[PDB]
Amino acid sequence: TPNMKDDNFSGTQSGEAMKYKLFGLEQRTKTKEGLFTKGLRRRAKLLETILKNTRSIDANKDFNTVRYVYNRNLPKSLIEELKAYIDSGGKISQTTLMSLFS
Amino acid sequence: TPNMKDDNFSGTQSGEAMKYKLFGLEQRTKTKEGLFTKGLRRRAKLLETIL
Amino acid sequence: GVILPVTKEFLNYTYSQFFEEMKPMIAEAFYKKFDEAGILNQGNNPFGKSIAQS
Amino acid sequence: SNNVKPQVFNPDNVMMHEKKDGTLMNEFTTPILQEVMENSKIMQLGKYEPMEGTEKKFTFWADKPGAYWVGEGQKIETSKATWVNATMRAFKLGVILPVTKEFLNYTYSQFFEEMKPMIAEAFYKKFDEAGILNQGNNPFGKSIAQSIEKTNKVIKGDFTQDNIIDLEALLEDDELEANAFISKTQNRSLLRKIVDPETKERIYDRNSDSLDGLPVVNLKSSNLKRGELITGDFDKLIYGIPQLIEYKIDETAQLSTVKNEDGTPVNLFEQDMVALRATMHVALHIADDKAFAKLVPA
Amino acid sequence: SNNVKPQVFNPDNVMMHEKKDGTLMNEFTTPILQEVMEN
Amino acid sequence: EKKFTFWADKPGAYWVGEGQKIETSKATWVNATM
Amino acid sequence: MLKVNEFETDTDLRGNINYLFNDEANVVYTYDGTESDLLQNVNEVSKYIEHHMDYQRPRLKVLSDYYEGKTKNLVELTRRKEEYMADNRVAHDYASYISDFINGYFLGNPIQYQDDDKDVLEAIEAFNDLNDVESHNRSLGLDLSIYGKAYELMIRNQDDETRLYKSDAMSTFIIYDNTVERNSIAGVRYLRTKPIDKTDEDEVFTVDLFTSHGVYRYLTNRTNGLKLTPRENSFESHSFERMPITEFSNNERRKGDYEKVITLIDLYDNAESDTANYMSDLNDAMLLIKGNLNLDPVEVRKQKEAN
Amino acid sequence: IRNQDDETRLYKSDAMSTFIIYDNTVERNSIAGVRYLRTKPIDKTDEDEVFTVDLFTSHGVYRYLTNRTNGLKLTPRENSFESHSFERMPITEFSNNERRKG
Amino acid sequence: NINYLFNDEANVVYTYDGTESDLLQNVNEVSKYIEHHMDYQRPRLKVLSDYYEGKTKNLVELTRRKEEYMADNRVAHDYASYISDFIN
Amino acid sequence: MDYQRPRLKVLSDYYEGKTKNLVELTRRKEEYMADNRVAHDYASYISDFIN
Amino acid sequence: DYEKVITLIDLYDNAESDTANYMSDLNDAMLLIKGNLNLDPVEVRKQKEAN
Amino acid sequence: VLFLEPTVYVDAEGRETEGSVDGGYIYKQYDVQGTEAYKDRLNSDIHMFTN
Residue A31: CB partners within 8 Å, gap ≥ 6? Predict the structure, then answer.
């Protein structure tokens, strides 16, 4: 855990300082993530079974194909990400772009 | 909570430095946010029923 | 009417909220004195009137 | 020595697999219980009181202020309030059961689990007979029967509507109202056959176990005689439990109150034994000695 | 005052921290209402 | 034939002063048969 | 107080079991027989319940009290020298700081789902939205962080909906097949009922036993030795085909996140309350006067204003 | 609450005087909510600490009077019951975290 | 403080086994919950509120202070308010 | 059992943090004095990082 | 990965628990008074508040 | 408070004199400067000769 009493900051790219300081914590979290997915797969196996027994879904379906995608709760910078997405060919609808700025 | 007595500031961009120093507070707030939405959904359920 | 004296040592160390909790007990004492005077003509009632006298 | 026949104990408490005559108790049919665990009646009737330490303090208002009639401009006179204190302390119940590890392995491995119910029953009965009837080496200097004895608040005679009403009245004579009756189940025979000759309604509900509308609680104890009945404002009976039943099972300590054949104490390690200790802390307080009355046969 | 024996009052209506026997009501737990109020 | 074991003696209990020896007691069963 | 006697005299020295690092705690329950071999002999479930209460629960309880900041330093100092001195009870809450940080880092951002078949993906999304799975997942992550393991129960509700609820770790456990595959044979949940106005002496527990084909309900209490007596309308069928409870683990060893630093937190508590006592009990400074002299205690009052 | 002027109004209820009694099932539906206040004028005082108590059910509000000294014996107030048109208990509880610690 | 904030009876979740009708017919049980709230939960909340208002223990625990000729110099720091306002 | 298992057991105990200092009660005096036996968990920190 | 440093982990445990014992067992500070004198143990209780 | 009252010695001719009491903390110490400079030199030379 970051030792707040003996701490220093670099520049302004907070996420890039954080990914360095939390490197040790990331190693454990990746194993936890493996076991957590191992559990979610059972949750899905149960859900498909009850759905089929109630015939709320076709008996042909298979739930083990689902891919669980995990993102860390690191801090992010919408201004930099907009510049990175619109450079390199991104497109945004006017109403959406307006919705991003308060 | 930021320890004002032992504090130093970088450059001029307030927002990113704040999102660094409040990283720990954000973790708790995200859970509070979940429980709060859980409550607002009930408020909405009551409102739809009376409407 | 009544007067309740208290040693300020008592009011500081023994029971700080004494006067706030005693106020209703005094009110009860007054109600009892009044009831006993009006109904039973007891307790040196000042009125010349009472149910017991009626 | 190399002597292989089993150890005789004094007292004969220890559970053993091999009977000394050479019978081995194996393929043992686990006993069955023909009875239901008795709840403690003090728990059933008394007011509970959370108690952190082994001791508790109570303080109550005792004197209220006076009042005076004062004429115009007369000196208002003084008055005073007063309080009083009371206190209650806990005592400890316990028993130990020794069990030979042969017995615990081959005869009846369940043994300690089956003893817990019967121990807690034994405790509850001990407590009830102490606090209610002042029997069984009552540690507390307090009890219902002892308050009754100091107040002489006893009625003499047979179970009758007359005496039962008088018994309940004996409490409001002190501005207290009865809450329940304590009786011996042997005597519901008597309660079942008493009826008002005027309204021709029976005072005891055979169906609901209610006497004069109040609930009746039955003691199993043998000290309370058939013809005896107890009543009181049980809200005045306060009990506390600093420590519920704790069980500890031990494999290395010594039992000193059990002696080997030669008179040596039993060592659980060297003699290959295991034993269970059950203990409980219980505290009893009679808030007002006058709140209880008793009816006794003449 | 510096009196080490508590002050005797006549009538004895004054509330006191120290009893006549020298007991001191420090950390004294607040009394409780053993009876209801009489309207 | 049928065979029953029933609990017959409940263990006892003792008022124990603090630090005093907790004494022991024993339960026993009885056998009956049909 | 010859030590061999301290058992019989109940002198033996109180709470000194280790709990956290004991061998019986944190074990995985296994059973050699099939589900039927277990269910026909319900007593065996009573043994597992007893073992859990006596060895696993205490560990979890300790962990939970640390998460609630009720560290050993608060409770133990109840036995402090309660003389005319100050209290100086202190608890630093490190356990909460840690668990909140690690859990927020892992699950503060919702898990996303992808699939190639939109029918399955939308059925999943419907179930997630109905059960508010985002908040559920975060709460599971928090139990993983403090206790090291967490449990979730899935039930078909009376309103005919598939519902997902977290089950507290102090009250839930699973009995697994003894094979290397370790399928879960049966799960149990048991809760102490109590009235609010009393301590129920018997400490009555309501026990639910989950099999792959239904839920069995029983009633017990501690002092009767946990003899399972079926509750009225004991059995209730469920339409899954496997035991509904699922268990999640923080790591291979199912050890909590701060479990291994509790001793350091304790040491920090003791050190800080020691400095607090030093501050409270000694006078900061004094004017020392020596030698044979007459000091009038009336004159000493001028000490603050004399030059 | 649906106001007298026929409007849906939302008001905060103080924590020191409000609580909810939940269904014992794992779902923990809220069975009933209660609010209670020590009513006082600003002159006299009473040893009967009289509390006004409002009990909210899924079908209405029940009003009672009590005091601590009689042992909190609930006596229905005049016009005790008042129906409300919701179909579930109106009070909602929010939590700072699972433990509800400040 | 400690004895009110960390009491096991404070902060508990109230549960009832019977239905709403089972309660409403037996309103007395509501009386028991009210009593329990007053005796255990309320004190905790009251202490938390007093700290938000800055009436910390040091200001009200005059029981062991001295004032025969020195000043009282009791103090309260209001950390509780600074924290709660910032986080909220 | 006689030679290899002991080694593996010890390595496992260090990963669990049951370092020698906790179990070696053999010296600490059973008086009014405090124990302060401590274990640091370096083994787990290292293994989790490297893995 | 830590087998070769288990001895250093042991040494760090010993050193830390040693300092924990020193902290536990010695008094931080005391007012030392020497010489032939009469101290009333009732008066010594004023030590915290005397000037 | 630590109070040390000296023994008073009485002479056969009636004289009186006091023993010398004393009290204070003592603590162990070692040559940190020289031992750390030595061990640092060893470590440095190992790495220098092994590049």
Answer: G251, G252, J48, J51
